[PDB]
Structure 1
Amino acid sequence: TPDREKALELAVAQIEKSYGKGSVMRLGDEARQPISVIPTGSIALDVALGIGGLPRGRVIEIYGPESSGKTTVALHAVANAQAAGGVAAFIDAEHALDPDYAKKLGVDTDSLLVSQPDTGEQALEIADMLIRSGALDIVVIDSVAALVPRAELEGEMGDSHVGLQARLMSQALRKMTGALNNSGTTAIFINQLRTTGGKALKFYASVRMDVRRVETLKDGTNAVGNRTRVKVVKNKCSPPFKQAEFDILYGKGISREGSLIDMGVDQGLIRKSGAWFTYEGEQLGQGKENARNFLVENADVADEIEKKIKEKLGIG
């Protein structure tokens, strides 16, 4: 009990020294809060991440099946990065971006940098060049799987295809990783399930986020969107394995308002009087949709609830 606590503290400090802060953690530890972070769009996810959003100057992975919300989550990071006066870049190998959708989430698409690269390496080379500017806050790569190597695209079969894309990622990441730390830019790599250089990205990433749809939500017989679930399977900035749920509405994106209520009830700041959402003596709405909508029209209290949740947990 007494002599052990000493050897353990020391052991942990040596580790923390030799390999960097967050190399070891107790899953009950509180997070050390950084100066700035990139909010994700959902307070529930931001809480689950510990530091109130995505880390800066780090590699991030967001993965899941097609149309899980990964991209939606990624674009929300992009919007918030811009909202705070940052500059954003989107390296696109899928050609699937919907800017009108992006726009409604909050993205300043007019001022969003976009490259549609010829090759996997060009994709990463370009990313690198922007990262080394120091003028970017966030860069998103859509996606890991589409980063096909020149040789494969040029028709050569000499390597066979065995490991050339994975080797490409590995190299690029090493080179890229130091660049991000100096610049303070965040690299989001989007990745699918069933990818190619994920073996490399898995270890360089400071945060890996497993995203998927849970249930379809609706008014009656018409699909408004999806309850989305994210597990932070890897986190080097705060205790990992935390998960959060939030709502994505088609054509609207993540319901900030929905996450505010869900976390409100969870934290006891919001009370239920049987389907009746209370806040500090005043009523928000009957059922979740009226609570959600009340907070839209009344963005005053929605900011107070958000502030109130953060303060109560030590976030932001």
Structure 2
Amino acid sequence: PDREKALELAVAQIEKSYGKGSVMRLGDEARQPISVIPTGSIALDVALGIGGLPRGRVIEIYGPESSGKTTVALHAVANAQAAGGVAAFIDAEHALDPDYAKKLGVDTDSLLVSQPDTGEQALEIADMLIRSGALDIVVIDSVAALVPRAELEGEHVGLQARLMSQALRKMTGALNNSGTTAIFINQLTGGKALKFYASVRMDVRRVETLKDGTVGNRTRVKVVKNKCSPPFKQAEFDILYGKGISREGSLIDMGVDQGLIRKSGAWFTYEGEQLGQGKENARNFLVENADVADEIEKKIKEKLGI
């Protein structure tokens, strides 16, 4: 009886002295913000709790080469722009494919891009850009490529981590004020600081190759760190070569997950209407009928926080 008070009281001190998400029960309902940046998959948006990536915060998306992290990052960029936001892409990797970015939603013409000479220049440019107040999102591709000036100039080893720590310390205050989201893409170094500064960390992986005959990959994302909603939630969704995340595919999956879409036979049905026989026909139905996809989306968001 008097214990529940003491705990609630303790949770409150922790909340006051360290911040809103400093302690959570894993069954807690998410703290719904005004605006977020959707990720392209409703499943991933739900796994994040707040319906997308938070604003004004450091975000890490990591995984193996071609795991899908950059695609997740580019959808964040597409969605941020679709809401009238400006985007930046700090590129020390030189891997970006704008044609891919166009197809999945990015306004590449509008995309600010910078190919910095050094690790510090990359982070400093990001900082100037953030402190402007004008950006909604900045992507850093990538953490590993942020090589320090001294290394590049040929002039001990360990200051790459000290560079990030110094940068993140200064950057984090700028992000909160501006409301800009910073996505750091990272591989499986210098991320030891990023691990603690990031409000969300996402572990992206290829789980299974999709197929017509012999197209894409089923992708799995675990939210290993989340200061905005209970962490350790995971999601799956499809990334189709040349197209990106199958938005419609995630609506079906979360559709059946939520009982809004019934899978009577190979047929997926919705509201008495039939969507298609098998997944691909249902997926295809929802892209041709954007109105019903929005209907299904609205219902899924309604039935949860999002």
Q: Report runs of 4+ in structure 1 exceeding 6 Å deviation.
A: none
- CA deviations 1:158-184 (Å, max 9, x no partner) are xxx431100000000000000000000
Of all paired residues, the percent bearing the same amino acid is: 100
> Given that residues 64 and 187 in structure 2 are in contact (C-alpha distance below 8 angstroms), is that contact kept between their aligned partners in structure 1?
yes
Structure 1: distance between partners of 2:164 and 2:263: 50
* Aligned-partner Cα distance in 1 for 2:76–2:265: 35
- State whether residues 249 and 283 of structure 2, in contact with CA within 8 Å, keep that contact through their aligned partners in structure 1: yes
Q: Write the distance in 2 (CA, Å) between the matches of 1:272 and 1:170.
A: 50
2:117 aligned residue: 118
Q: 1:246-269 CA distances to partner (integer Å, 9 max, x unpaired)?
A: 000010000000000000000000
Which position in structure 2 is the counterpart of 1:303?
Answer: 294
Task: Determine if the alignment matches structure 1 residue 279 to structure 2 residue 270.
Answer: yes
Contact 2:62/2:204, CA 8 A, preserved across alignment: yes
In structure 2, the residue matched to 1:134 is: 133
Once the two structures are TM-superposed, the CA of residue 232 in structure 1 deviates from its matched residue by 0.1
Residue 237 of structure 1 pairs with residue 236 of structure 2: no
| CA distance in 2: counterparts of 1:198 and 1:128, whole angstroms | 18
Rounded Cα–Cα distance in structure 1 between residues aligned with 2:25 and 2:78: 33
Secondary structure of 1:201's counterpart equals helix
Distance (whole Å) between structure 1 residues aligned to residue 233 and residue 87 of structure 2: 27
TM-score (norm 2): 1.00
Distance, in Å, in 2 between the alignment partners of 1:20 and 1:94 is 35
Partner in structure 1 of residue 89 of structure 2: 90
Q: Aligned equivalents of 2:161 and 2:259: distance in 1?
A: 47
Cα offset, 1:273, TM superposition: 1.2
2:49/2:305 contact within 8 Å kept: no
- Quote the offset at 1:205 in angstroms: 0.1
* 2:133 counterpart SS class: coil
- Check conservation: 2:38, 2:76, Cα contact below 8 A: yes
More deviation, 161-170/256-265: 161-170
Partner of 1:17: helix, strand, or coil?
helix
Structure 1 residue runs of 5 or longer lacking an equivalent are none
> 1:200: how far off?
0.5
Residues 180-218 of structure 1: CA deviation (Å, up to 9, x unaligned): 00000000000001xx11100000000000000000001
For the residues of structure 2 that align with 1:283 and 1:304, how far apart are their CA atoms? Answer: 14
Deviation at 1:314, TM superposition (A): 1.8
Question: Residues 58-84 of structure 1: CA distance to partner in whole angstroms, max 9, x if unpaired?
Answer: 000000000000000000000000000
Q: Distance in 1 between matches of 2:163 and 2:112?
A: 24
Count of residue pairs the alignment pairs up: 306
Q: Deviations over 1:122-152 (max 9, x none)?
A: 0000000000000000000000000000000
Retained in 1: the 8 A contact 2:287–2:293?
yes
Measured against aligned partners, the alpha-carbon deviations of 1:44-97 in whole angstroms (never above 9, x if no partner) come to: 000000000000000000000000000000000000000000000000000000
What are the superposed Cα offsets for residues 3-28 of structure 1, whole Å, 9 maximum, x if unpaired? 00000000000000000001000000
Q: SS state of the match for residue 307, structure 1?
A: helix
- Per the TM alignment, residue 298 of structure 1 is displaced from its structure 2 partner at its CA by 0.1
How large is the RMSD of aligned CA atoms in angstroms? 0.4
Match of 2:209 among 216, 219, 229: 216
How far apart, in 2, do the equivalents of 1:229 and 1:237 lie? 20
Q: Secondary structure at the match of 1:18?
A: helix
In structure 2, distance between residues paired with 1:275 and 1:48:
27
